């Protein structure tokens, strides 16, 4: 009946003076817009359909056209910014927020989905959705004693939409919207659905990707243990954002970092640091680097958890981007650690993999490494072990790489490189 219509038939039905004909054509439009396989979103836009779909959002009397049009508009809003912008420009936001109160769960879910596509576009539409008042009615949909009584696809959708209200950064969402949403987010984080968890962690990750005050808002909700637990999850879609969130938290203050340590995060890193997914390994190493940038007692926890050998292993063999985070983790460790922690690091075998990485055609990793070497030499000075270390660096072929790095055409490379050769070799 409504499969494979032309856009001009859809226009003809929508322009009829007949609510059923409009309904049928809207459903035809929706079935068209559901075939991706490149849905004809621009064709529908160019036909001038959007304002009509938006008006059908308000046909309370005709729940099915509300739904078809919601779905059509959802799918348009899923497109490019310009496509989402067409939907918004039609007045869809307030109309979708009204549909959130719909007694039809499939329609309010559709309105949720649409608003998630709109908010998903970026800061401006996110904040516009927020200004139109989406958050109360969104949150009210979750104001049930037990999230388990909600339909799964429904909950997943809310979670997803709410995560897009948490997302994007220039600017970050309004502080008061973040505060309004956080309690429901904390609750979704304890929900036993892997997708709701993935998206809750993503929302939390977006909220912690910011200045310390933003990190703090989240850390204060007491989420860090739950994040740490999610970090141990077997589902990579949960581990990925739990780790992003944890990682973001440790770029915060040493006190925020300590919350992650106290939550037991470091016990998961043997796994994460050897994780077969290179993204997790990279991000775990990055996370590591912002913990080794912390206090000596925090470096100590890294040591105590057995993590230095795992840093050495990542430094020895990892995807290059992970090796570069490991290099960072080591510089930070060496710049901030006690002499005994730094000696420890050397006893674990840091030197040969650090030296092997001086062979990398990447100028920032060389500077990070040379800088770690200097830090290590500085610790060796405090002990009169500069000779024992110089030999070590020389035996693994590290002197040859530092010597060859004076012929390097970079301001800090040849400067720190010549400084080391002249000072120790």
């Amino acid at each position: 009946g409504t499969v494979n219509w032309s856009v001009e038939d859809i226009v003809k039905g929508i322009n009829s003076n007949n609510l059923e004909s409009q309904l049928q054509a809207t459903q035809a439009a929706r079935k068209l817009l559901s075939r991706e396989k490149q849905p004809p979103i621009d064709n529908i836009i160019r036909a001038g359909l959007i304002p009509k779909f938006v008006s059908f959002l308000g046909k309370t009397d005709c729940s099915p056209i509300q739904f078809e049009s919601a779905w059509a508009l959802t799918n348009i809003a899923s497109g490019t910014s310009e496509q989402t912008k067409a939907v918004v420009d039609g007045g869809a936001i307030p109309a979708f927020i009204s549909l959130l109160a719909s007694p039809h769960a499939h329609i309010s879910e559709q309105a949720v989905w649409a608003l998630g596509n709109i908010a998903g576009d970026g800061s401006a539409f996110r904040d516009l959705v927020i200004k139109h008042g989406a958050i109360d009615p969104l949150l009210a949909l979750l104001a049930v004693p037990d999230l388990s009584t909600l339909a799964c696809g429904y909950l997943r959708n809310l979670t997803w939409t709410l995560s897009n209200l948490c997302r994007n950064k220039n600017p970050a969402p309004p502080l008061d919207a973040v505060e309004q949403i956080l309690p429901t987010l904390v609750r979704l984080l304890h929900h036993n659905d892997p997708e709701v968890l993935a998206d809750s962690c993503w929302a939390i990750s977006y909220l912690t990707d910011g200045p310390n005050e933003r990190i703090e808002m989240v850390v204060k909700k007491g989420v860090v243990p739950q994040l740490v637990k999610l970090l141990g999850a077997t589902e990579l879609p949960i581990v990925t954002p739990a780790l992003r969130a944890i990682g973001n938290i440790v770029t915060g203050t040493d006190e925020q970092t300590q919350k992650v340590i106290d939550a037991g995060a470091l016990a998961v890193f043997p796994s994460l640091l050897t994780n077969p997914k290179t993204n997790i390994q990279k991000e775990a190493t990055w996370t590591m680097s912002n913990i080794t940038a912390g206090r000596q007692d925090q470096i100590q926890q890294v040591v105590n958890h057995g993590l230095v050998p795992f840093l050495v292993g990542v430094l020895s063999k990892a995807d290059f981007k992970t090796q570069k985070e490991a290099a960072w983790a080591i510089t930070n460790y060496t710049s901030g650690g006690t002499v005994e922690q730094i000696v420890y690091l050397v006893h674990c075998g840091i030197i040969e993999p650090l030296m092997n990485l001086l062979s990398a055609k990447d100028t920032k990793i060389i500077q990070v490494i040379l800088d770690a070497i200097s830090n290590i030499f500085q610790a060796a000075e405090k002990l009169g072990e500069t000779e024992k270390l110089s030999i070590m660096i020389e035996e693994c072929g590290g002197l040859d790489k530092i010597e060859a790095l004076q012929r390097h055409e970079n301001e800090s490379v040849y400067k720190a490189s010549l400084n080391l050769i002249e000072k120790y070799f």
């Binding site: 959802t74 799918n75 989905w113 576009d121 970026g122 997302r167 977006y206 990707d209």
Partner: peptide, 12 residues
């Protein structure tokens, strides 16, 4: 970051 910003609905 991350998972998709926008989602096309293909099924009911």
């Amino acid at each position: 970051d991350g998972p998709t910003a926008k989602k096309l609905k293909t099924e009911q």
